[PDB]
TrEMBL record, chain D:
Reported function: Component of the gamma-tubulin ring complex (gTuRC) which mediates microtubule nucleation. The gTuRC regulates the minus-end nucleation of alpha-beta tubulin heterodimers that grow into microtubule protafilaments, a critical step in centrosome duplication and spindle formation.
Covered range of the whole protein: 572 to 654 of 666
Cellular localisation: Cytoplasm, Cytoskeleton, Microtubule organizing center, Centrosome
Record note on quaternary structure: Component of the gamma-tubulin ring complex (gTuRC) consisting of TUBGCP2, TUBGCP3, TUBGCP4, TUBGCP5 and TUBGCP6 and gamma-tubulin TUBG1 or TUBG2. TUBGCP2, TUBGCP3, TUBGCP4, TUBGCP5 and TUBGCP6 assemble in a 5:5:2:1:1 stoichiometry; each is associated with a gamma-tubulin, thereby arranging 14 gamma-tubulins in a helical manner. Gamma-tubulin at the first position is blocked by TUBGCP3 at the last position, allowing 13 protafilaments to grow into a microtubule.
Family note: Belongs to the TUBGCP family.
Record's protein name: Gamma-tubulin complex component
Gene, per the UniProt record: tubgcp4.L
Organism per entry: Xenopus laevis (African clawed frog)
Amino acid sequence: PREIITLQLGQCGNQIGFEFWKQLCAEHGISPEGIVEEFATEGTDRKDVFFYQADDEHYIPRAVLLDLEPRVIHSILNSPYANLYNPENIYLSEHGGGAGNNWASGFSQGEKIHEDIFDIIDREADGSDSLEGFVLCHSIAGGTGSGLGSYLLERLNDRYPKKLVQTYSVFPNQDEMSHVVVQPYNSLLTLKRLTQNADCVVVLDNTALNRIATDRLHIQNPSFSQINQLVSTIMSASTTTLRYPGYMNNDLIGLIASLIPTPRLHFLMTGYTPLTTDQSVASVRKTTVLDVMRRLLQPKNVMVSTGRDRQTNHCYIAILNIIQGEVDPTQVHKSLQRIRERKLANFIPWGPASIQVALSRKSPYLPSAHRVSGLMMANHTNISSLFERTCRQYDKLRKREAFLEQFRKEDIFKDNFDELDNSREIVQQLIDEYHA
Amino acid sequence: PREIITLQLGQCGNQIGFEFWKQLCAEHGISPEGIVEEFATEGTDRKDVFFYQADDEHYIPRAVLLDLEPRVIHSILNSPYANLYNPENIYLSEHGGGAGNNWASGFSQGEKIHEDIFDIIDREADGSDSLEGFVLCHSIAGGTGSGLGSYLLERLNDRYPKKLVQTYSVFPNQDEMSHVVVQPYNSLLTLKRLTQNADCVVVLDNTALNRIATDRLHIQNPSFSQINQLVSTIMSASTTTLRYPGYMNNDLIGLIASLIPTPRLHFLMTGYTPLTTDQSVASVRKTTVLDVMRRLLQPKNVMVSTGRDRQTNHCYIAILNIIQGEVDPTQVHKSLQRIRERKLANFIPWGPASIQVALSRKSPYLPSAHRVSGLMMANHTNISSLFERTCRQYDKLRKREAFLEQFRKEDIFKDNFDELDNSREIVQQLIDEYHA
Amino acid sequence: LDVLNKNYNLLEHMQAMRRYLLLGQGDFIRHLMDLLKPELVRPATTLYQHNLTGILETAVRATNAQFDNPEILKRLDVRLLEVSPGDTGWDVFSLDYHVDGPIATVFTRECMSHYLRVFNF
Amino acid sequence: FILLKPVFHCLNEILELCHSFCSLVSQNLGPLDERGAGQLDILVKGFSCQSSLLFRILSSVRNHQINPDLAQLLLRLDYNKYY
């Protein structure tokens, strides 16, 4: 009765949501063809959370997988986790459209599958007891996922009044500009819809990902396939207080409420420490819980690139530390004492902040209940570093004579370009303005 | 001693009663000319309630079969169910008439065979001292059963209003329009006599069957003959506390008493869920009592069309929910708590309403008494949608000007055409006024 | 400790009264209070009680579909208090882990009077 | 025989009072008569003597643990008069 429909979209965005469901099948003790384990009732006392209750004695996802190219969805039927998905109830078979590239391509193409894109998500919320909302699992990389992914931010904001909108925006490799070059454009276009039509977002970047991909995995080839494993894990980690009972803030509309002071300051930084083959073997000899929430305030587990000097030009207001698995609970309240002792995150003097600590039980399967995982879902005002990063690459691109005539043949015959520069400079000043 | 005399009439009207009686022999566990087992009397504790009471060891129908075409009863003369009827009494073999495809052919043959049509149904009532009534097993379809049946709706109303009159009105097929074209005309004349010279009608829509026949049976093209199968089952289904002895509402005028607050608001929508034969391979392990009567508040169990956007603009006043067979009887009072709590229908809040649940045993033949059956006999006030649907097809015909002197050469020498548009807006407004 | 294990499941109900009345499991209780919220906003009545009794039963089927088999749900009930009508109508509704058997040897009347006080906070 | 005195008297009086609603209907051309409306007026009193008498039972039904199975049955037919 807090059920969320994922709107998986994009060429990359279906892939990052694919392993999110494959992650869920391993903790719910299901198989992608039935129910097998009895650990499913004894471990989780509420299996429904993003699943519709059974009509074949099998829990059905609430997932939709739409993309312009049919190639990405044909890259799922060769896997037999496409028998967890049904052929026309979850993905629609042969979803067509453009090639595609440019943000304005996919934005006008949802207006002609306008009937049909909302008849597969209104055709699943038609069973739901009371729908919480919608999580739009889409990508800013390419023009396919970013173009159409921005359209569902409009139409769910005038046909749904009190439903949660929130996207896991994955900004592409910023050092690359030869992989995609329409990148400062499709990013700032989407950033405008997230500050006057979205509520809250979860920011992620790839150049800071690869900072961890060469330190904890030590693979020297960056690709889409090795980067969906890091992404699916924090998706399931962020809602384990709805998957299993919490206590207080046991809703997702509980967690998010305390992570936001005002809109256009709702961009949350994620951090996720364990990605090593040494962490599994050092939790058997005990690892402490009094230092897995003092290691998250070291900035090198974060997937959002920011200064080493913008971390004392900005003050934290809400920081949430959800530890899962092993957790020693006669000293977990003692671990939250020790944050104020180090002062590695500052706090606002004029208003009251929050050092939020939370806990939740995992899978009743042992090597996924005895390892220390520390999830951070921060709210730091140093998120303006990515906005300056996209915005300096945007004014730079238009002075290199590009997308001033290569963007004005896709139904765009007016200026709306300096509407994107000025609206980003208002957002970036108002984030900083909220602290004194 | 509630002996009912059936008036099976019309081309299609003989066909829907033909299998009604053939079902009853199948449920009495007896051959059609004798009594062949002792499981018939120990299992069925009262077999006679339409049948003529026994004195030859075989129970014989109280049926009259009139049609203008003698061809439907000659396809019964050589069929081996002519010993479950009589070809010199029950049905007159070689009963003439026209084709017929006129309302005024049959209306004027009942005005010269007027003595004989009422002396074939009081020779079928001479085995009961105190008669229940007459059930008009006739159709609004074609001009035979609909042309002659309006004469019987008046003259059995002014010689017998004390008694039950009740018809199963099987609406003309609206996908026919080139085979029958007198269809808006003969339908509104028989409906005009049904709102003041009749107690009850039981509305049945034909085009709304064939909607369900392609979703639960999945036959390639539902043709008339596989449409008579769906009616005869629901007919034997409505008598299940009248045949097998109940204890509450064990007369037919018992059930109908709380399903009719006021005349001309008596039109019952019928629903029957076990059309899906995937209910049966799940009720062999039991399908719960907690969901067998929530599916009688599902707006897709209906055999009749009604509004959907008029289900929040109107309210239910009386809905009867017959579950049959296996029921588990001690959690049926637990299920009725749970109807009102989700709110799966609206119900009027100003005055009297009733959500009636009943239960009954079936046949001593287990391969049709171990599969959950749900009969809805609704009365919802959005039934005024059907009177608009027929009327939009009536005034559209009078605007091409047909049947304004091509219909006044036989027994009409007046103009009662705008009396039928008027009588329909009278009906639609007095139904709509009753709630608030 | 062996006769309880066969009959009463005593030290499991030591855990079970902590999961509802103190809300160890909040999802069960949020999913109750949710449907219940348009019903508590109005002033209390004497036509009040008949739907609080089935807003529980509509809640424990709505929040499970695989944990109805235990006898824990049947041994917890809804407790009502005679509250006068002037008030929101929220300090009326309360749950209690219904005991009255030889299972009430670790529960007593001075116990559920203190469970009534922790329930309000 | 629901509870010894009170409730049992409310109920058999209920079926006595609609047995006179039968004798109120059994008139042929009843309402267009002076006695047709005269008889009506007495019974609309005799009925609210029962809706109020049933109402005192409901306060005791609200009051905790009279007999729960008595209160679940009597409120079930009452929400069944409403919805």
